Design a protein around this ligand. Structure first.
Ligand SMILES: CC(=O)N[C@H]1[C@H]([C@H](O)[C@H](O)CO)OC(C(=O)O)=C[C@@H]1NC(=N)N
Ligand SMILES: CC(=O)N[C@H]1[C@H]([C@H](O)[C@H](O)CO)OC(C(=O)O)=C[C@@H]1NC(=N)N
Ligand SMILES: CC(=O)N[C@H]1[C@H]([C@H](O)[C@H](O)CO)OC(C(=O)O)=C[C@@H]1NC(=N)N
Ligand SMILES: CC(=O)N[C@H]1[C@H]([C@H](O)[C@H](O)CO)OC(C(=O)O)=C[C@@H]1NC(=N)N
Ligand SMILES: *[C@@H]1O[C@H](CO)[C@@H](O)[C@H](O)[C@H]1NC(C)=O
Ligand SMILES: *[C@@H]1O[C@H](CO)[C@@H](O)[C@H](O)[C@H]1NC(C)=O
Ligand SMILES: *[C@@H]1O[C@H](CO)[C@@H](O)[C@H](O)[C@H]1NC(C)=O
Ligand SMILES: *[C@@H]1O[C@H](CO)[C@@H](O)[C@H](O)[C@H]1NC(C)=O
Ligand SMILES: [Ca+2]
Ligand SMILES: [Ca+2]
Ligand SMILES: [Ca+2]
Ligand SMILES: [Ca+2]
Ligand SMILES: [Ca+2]
Ligand SMILES: [Ca+2]
Lengths: 390, 390, 390, 390
């Protein structure tokens, strides 16, 4: 039958470049004839032959009559959808997978696993589907909005790992990792370390033995919670990223948080999901990240890379590697993913560029993709091109 | 060739949970750019690899100009259509299988069999199609609207069984079962027992030897005719469900039908097609059923279960297992179906949620899907989200 | 590689029944959101796994701004298109195959052959495509609108046969048959007999040795030219159908043409393409035909069958076998085709139901399908359901 | 695996004929319900099984609200897109391959390679994608709009060759050829000879050892730079076509450029990309070319051929072989491509037919296709049928 997928060394390259923009709302004018779905929280996951562009829709299209409520996060209509990457996610092109206001998905070499969360805020539910079949669920353990990544989960040898968390957006949210095999939870991993708040982890394989995640702390710091998960022992430990280049929004000025690596610092309340992807080379490991250009608003998006070291102990600034979205453009969630070439994996970061005109109108997003490509430096930025008044 | 499908034991689990909502008319606004088909009597049937969401279209879209007639049942334009479960049944996404104002379909492991009925009321006709080929028909035997299930037929080792019935909607309608192999009827099975009115059976496998059906009596009782068809002998017997939880609409209060199990009781005229699906375990069988929350109108929908016992003699209440559709929301036909996971079958119930705004405007439906998924209790209900004035 | 296709015995059955209606313009209202293509001359051809519904479009959709000219037969924009049978032929669902104002197509077991005719009226061109590749052409031999069937060609052992004709619509048009193998003309067959005018032949296999065609004579008779083509010798002879049930429109009353089988009779000028398909049984051959209900206008469509005999010498009336389209509905071109079941072929007749409001508005058609199905008699008729004012 | 593609001898034939017209804006009326994409620089490339129709979209549809900018060449929204040849390149039918304002693509027998260029004018970048994976890039070497073919690249035994160029549009632009294998550049080939300005090469195989290109000189001459690239040594040489039939637009009258073959002549500034395709026979090679009917404007398009000889020294007129687009109709870029029949290759030329209504309104194009087909002479021209005011 198909072989189980494993992380492979990354394809040769030393800079990211602009790849593709899926800007569905370039076709949503009242005088046009299209039906782009109103979405937020897009992410991409690839199998050996194809990538799927996922998102949580509000089950409404532009132009339409259901714009009121599209700036709300959770409700009974939101669903996990996808199209093949490169197709415009319209009413007719998309697949509705399950009811969900928080999702994830990944391919293990043989089939797709889709994860969706819905239920009341105080008692929500992780629902897992493997192909066509709904296969398992997991219960709220802290009864305050159980939720997951909003990016791809990660499979090795048929075991797919997924961060879930539950708890207050203003207090404690201790995340946990599920090991899912063929749609069924075969292990629950309870992390050790700086565990007071970890959510919206962007995860990937550092090697066949370790998964790493750059996460969001919505209450205490602008440094990202950084997870190291040993896949063989099924143990995880979390400590804050020590780099002075704080990747969350809001954040203080770089290098202004004094004291040891663990110090929380100022402007900790609030957050944003951030891009992170690995370049696995025979000798070294590159960790690529993205953060907004604004320190306080979801505007702009810049690339950073650091080779080797320990993200937990190194205060050194990450190397600035290009402006993907200028400060004039919206820069909201970003996520890492990998495209499978014939013999190696191509690391990419995707960026959600939300069209926000507030609650009085529709609310949705475009997705920009940057990927490792050749050498030199990043050459061009992405604009969505949408005028929200049309 | 691929091999014939057989019922297997159900995937482990102990509660249903909200799975998927296909609400096409969320995109049918006059200022939108979509063409959801006007449909009624939706149902789902799955093969080894995919599920198809079938329905009986009025061959008209919303927005459109052919709303006069969409509250009629039978007319020369009605057709059986489908999309892969998860696609929006729109004009371009659907496949039109045959002219039909009554339908069923199922997969035997190798190919799909589609059943449609059309023709004048006095002389209607069952038409069978295997794949692309029209293979056989069956004539009206009581000359009064020959009709069928409006839910999946059931195949075992290549033999697919189908309830057909014929006769007065407020009188006698003695059903019969067709045994169809590769699109040709190879046997007629004439049931025994309480046979005066059985229609719209929701059937499935209780094991490899027995198919059971929960049906509608539109004339005499609010209790459901319960069919047990022995697949090895190709014989069937029907008796009324004895449970005090009357599953039909309209119905009297639970437990008010005094006297022996077969007593018809009060508020017998009228009916609704009802959900029913089996959870086969090694030494226990679960029978899951759905009924409206209103005793008289097609509003709401609640889940019920009972493990083991004989439906024909057990007067005990069914155990209530969640509100799938609130009293506020439409709850029309419901049906059972199973999804094929790798080693086991997943029981589900789907719910037709009709948008009823009277004869004065368009008429159509959403489909809500609930499936056995994990443990605990059912967490959330479904709303269609459609404002019929847009 | 795939086996070459051959005619097989027909599936068991003794009556045709209503199968499917593709009425695209049920979705073309000015207030709707669809784009049905404006077409005429539809036909269907099936391979082992799928049928394709072909037609000549005017390269215009309803609603639209290019209605003027859609009642003209030939122009530089017309093209042969198709969708999979059961899909609505819209702008996006259809495939444009080649420029063509006269077409044909058939599958030989391995690939599809598409034939299209365009060029000036005095010097047009047969163009043949095999899969993606344009492979051959044939030249006008009488320099007066070279044209072909407007129905499926017929392949046996990899040789596909096709009627083409050229000459005056009011005078002599001596048809010829091409034997095409893998897109290339390997033989030209010059018919013998009553050859003064044969066009728009509907052809099919009577056996592995003989192809037969019921054709149109636009100038001299209302009896159809009937072709018998021996596939082994590659010779064809044509004589008029002798049945008193004249299948052309216009036509005199049945049985009013006195004299021998060859007599032309009255009301010979004008014509219509007619349905014809074979039911090949081990012992006997049924020839199924269709003609309009009106003797003079393209209104209504009735089925007729005759078993055995010689169509050239038998004056006997064909057996009336059902009203497919009533006299209130449009009945224009009709064609035969066969659907491949697992072990046998299912004969069908398709009917073009044109929406004609004259030259001041759009002009297009619906396609109704009737197929051999069970026993008894034909039970229901087809209406397109379209109101040309919406 | 499948094997590598090699040029083969061409299918037998001696004239081109009108094959297919893809006119998307026949469906772009404000009162219609379609979304044809606004595109320019279309081209076609075929693999063993299918052809893809590529183009450079402005990421806007007709009707729509983003027409300001559609007469620009380079901007951050331009993307390489495709549909299977014969599908209408609409918003939902197309696949968006990468951000690109200059492109090429071709199939090597196993997979597709897509090439896009974007980035600032002074520092643009070639991006290569093999299948789904972004595999390599190539930097600007003259810092003045690095660009490529806008027609198919060409693969032999897995090596795909591509013309890239860089430099002033009214000065020096010395092209280079990239040899790409499975999406990675394995060699740069620096041409020899008349090298001062070569761009938008239309390339193809003259045999298994030589690729030839007919290119555009936008600065100095109306004669086309003619490249002969030896595939075995990976060396190229460029000299101007000596034919008195100048293939560029603008151009002086045929034969007015006096002096030796390499004389630049008059009306050299400005240009157009031009069609060119080979007809390989056992002992003769046919070179087919297209040019506008107007000597100064992009109006009309005529076919020309010459068999054998050396394009670099033969001053003889090319033989005129038909009007494909009349003086009345737009004739913009043209390109060559080959379709793969079972045993041989079919030469074709496609023509971009731009709808030009000025800067004041939308701008886009149809594509007309002519292919070698049978014998005789070319019979009919192509019109787009689009009224730009609708
Ligand atoms: C489950 C849920 O509602 N998650 C929210 C998320 C969350 O709200 C914060 O992370 C605080 O915990 O914030 C945001 C956000 O954009 O700030 C988007 C998410 N929207 C959705 N996932 N639908
Ligand atoms: C054959 C037919 O017309 N079936 C009717 C059905 C029927 O009248 C009752 O069951 C009484 O026999 O009622 C209903 C209904 O919703 O009450 C829908 C069905 N409509 C369709 N399935 N088309
Ligand atoms: C090639 C052509 O123009 N054929 C005509 C056809 C023909 O005109 C008569 O058969 C007389 O020879 O008539 C008709 C018709 O509907 O009467 C339709 C055809 N339309 C198209 N094939 N486009
Ligand atoms: C790279 C680029 O911008 N190419 C231009 C091209 C160019 O200006 C000339 O060849 C001079 O170098 O002209 C034209 C043109 O139609 O004249 C189209 C191209 N547009 C695009 N392919 N996007
Ligand atoms: C991971 O392990 C698999 C299976 O043993 C191997 O194919 C793959 O190349 C390994 N990845 C590395 C070395 O990064
Ligand atoms: C039914 O029998 C088949 C073998 O004939 C087996 O594969 C399947 O598991 C059985 N299922 C039940 C529920 O007995
Ligand atoms: C036609 O010939 C083929 C090949 O010999 C055979 O398979 C088929 O059954 C024959 N058809 C008849 C007997 O009608
Ligand atoms: C080129 O060579 C290949 C074998 O390497 C052969 O298949 C093909 O026919 C040849 N074509 C020409 C034009 O020489
Ligand atoms: Ca924070
Ligand atoms: Ca739509
Ligand atoms: Ca009842
Ligand atoms: Ca006639
Ligand atoms: Ca459309
Ligand atoms: Ca020039």
């Amino acid at each position: 039958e198909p072989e189980w997928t494993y992380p492979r060394l990354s394809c040769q390259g030393s800079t990211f470049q602009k790849a593709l923009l899926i800007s569905p709302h370039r076709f949503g004018e009242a005088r046009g004839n299209s039906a782009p779905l109103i979405i937020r929280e897009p992410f991409i996951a690839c199998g050996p032959k194809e990538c799927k562009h996922f998102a949580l829709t509000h089950y409404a299209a532009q132009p339409g009559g259901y714009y009121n409520g599209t700036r709300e996060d959770r409700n009974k209509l939101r669903h996990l959808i996808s199209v093949k990457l490169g197709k415009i996610p319209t009413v007719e092109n998309s697949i509705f997978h399950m009811a969900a206001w928080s999702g994830s998905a990944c391919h293990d070499g043989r089939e797709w696993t889709y994860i969706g969360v819905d239920g009341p805020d105080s008692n929500a539910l992780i629902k897992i589907k493997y192909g066509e079949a709904y296969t398992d669920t997991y219960h709220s353990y802290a009864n305050n909005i159980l939720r997951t990544q909003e990016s791809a989960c990660n499979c090795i040898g048929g075991d797919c790992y997924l961060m879930i968390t539950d708890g207050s957006a203003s207090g404690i949210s201790k995340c946990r990792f599920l090991k899912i095999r063929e749609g069924r939870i075969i292990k629950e991993i309870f992390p050790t370390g700086r565990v007071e708040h970890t959510e919206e982890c962007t995860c990937g394989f550092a090697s066949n033995k370790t998964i790493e995640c750059a996460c969001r702390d919505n209450s205490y710091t602008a440094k990202r919670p950084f997870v190291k998960l040993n896949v063989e022992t099924d143990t995880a430990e979390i400590r804050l990223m020590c780099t002075e280049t704080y990747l969350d929004t809001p954040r203080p000025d770089d290098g202004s948080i004094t004291g040891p690596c663990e110090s929380n610092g100022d402007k900790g309340r609030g957050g944003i999901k951030g891009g992170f992807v690995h370049q696995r080379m025979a000798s070294k490991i590159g960790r690529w990240y993205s953060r907004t250009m604004s320190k306080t608003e979801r505007m702009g998006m810049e690339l950073y890379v650091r080779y080797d070291g320990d993200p937990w102990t190194d205060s050194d600034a990450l190397a600035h590697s290009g402006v993907m979205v200028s400060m004039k453009e919206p820069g909201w969630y970003s996520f890492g993913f990998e495209i499978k070439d014939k013999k190696c994996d191509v690391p990419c970061i995707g960026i959600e560029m939300v069209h926000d005109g507030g609650k009085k109108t529709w609310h949705s997003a475009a997705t920009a993709i940057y990927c490792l490509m050749g050498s030199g430096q990043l050459l061009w930025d992405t604009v969505t091109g949408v005028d929200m008044a049309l």
